[PDB]
Amino acid sequence: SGEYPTVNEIPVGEVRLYQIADGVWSHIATQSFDGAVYPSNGLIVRDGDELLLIDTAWGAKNTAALLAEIEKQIGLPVTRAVSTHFHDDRVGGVDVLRAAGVATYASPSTRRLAEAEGNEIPTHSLEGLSSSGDAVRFGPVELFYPGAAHSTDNLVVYVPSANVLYGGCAVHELSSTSAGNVADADLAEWPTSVERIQKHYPEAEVVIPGHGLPGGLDLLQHTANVVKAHKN
Ligand SMILES: C[C@H](Oc1ccc(CCN)cc1)c1cccc2c(-c3ccc(CS(C)(=O)=O)c(Cl)c3)c(C(=O)O)[nH]c12
Ligand SMILES: [Zn+2]
Ligand SMILES: [Zn+2]
Rounded to the nearest angstrom, the distance between the alpha carbon of 180 and the centre of ligand 1 is 5
Please, which residues bridge with residue 209 across strands? 168
Q: Taking CB atoms and a 6 Å cutoff, what residues make up the pocket around ligand 1? A: 33, 38, 87-89, 117, 150, 169, 172, 176-178, 180-181, 183-184, 210-211
Which residue, judged by its Cα, is nearest atom 3 of ligand 1?
Answer: 87
What is the topology classification, in CATH, of domain 7-231?
Answer: Metallo-beta-lactamase; Chain A (3.60.15)
CB 163, CB 204: distance < 8 Å: yes
Q: How far is the C-alpha of 207 from the C-alpha of 130, rounded, in Å?
A: 23
Rounded to the nearest angstrom, the distance between the alpha carbon of 56 and the centre of ligand 2 is 12
Q: How far is the C-alpha of 51 from the C-alpha of 169, rounded, in Å?
A: 22
CB 194, CB 220: distance < 8 Å: yes
Q: How far is the C-alpha of 167 from the C-alpha of 146, rounded, in Å?
A: 10
Catalytic positions: 85, 87, 89, 150, 181
Burial category of 100 from C-beta neighbours within 10 Å (exposed 0-12, middle 13-18, buried 19 and up): middle
Query: What are the phi and psi torsion angles at 96 (to 5°)?
Result: -60, -50
The string of DSSP codes covering the chain is: --SPP-GGGS-TT--EEEEEETTEEEEEEEEEETTEEEEEEEEEEEETTEEEEES--SSHHHHHHHHHHHHHHT---EEEEE-SSSSHHHHTTHHHHHHTT-EEEE-HHHHHHHHHHT----SEE--S-SSTT-EEEETTEEEE---SSSSTT--EEEETTTTEEEEETTS--TT-SS-S--TT--TTTHHHHHHHHHHH-TT-SEEEESSS--B-THHHHHHHHHHHHHH-
Nearest C-alpha neighbor of 57 from the set 84, 24, 32, 92: 92
Query: What are the phi and psi torsion angles at 79 (to 5°)?
Result: -105, -25
Atom of ligand 1 nearest to the CA of 34: 15
Q: Is 89 annotated as a binding residue?
A: yes
CA atoms within 13 A on the CB side of 54: 34
Nearest C-alpha neighbor of 156 from the set 127, 139, 178, 132: 132
Please, which residues bridge with residue 164 across strands? 159, 206
Strands of the 124-125 sheet, one edge to the other: 16-21, 24-33, 36-47, 50-54, 78-82, 103-106, 124-125
Which residue, judged by its Cα, is nearest atom 7 of ligand 1?
Answer: 183
Q: How far is the C-alpha of 129 from the C-alpha of 17, rounded, in Å?
A: 29
Query: What are the phi and psi torsion angles at 112 (to 5°)?
Result: -65, -45
Q: Is 127 annotated as a binding residue?
A: yes
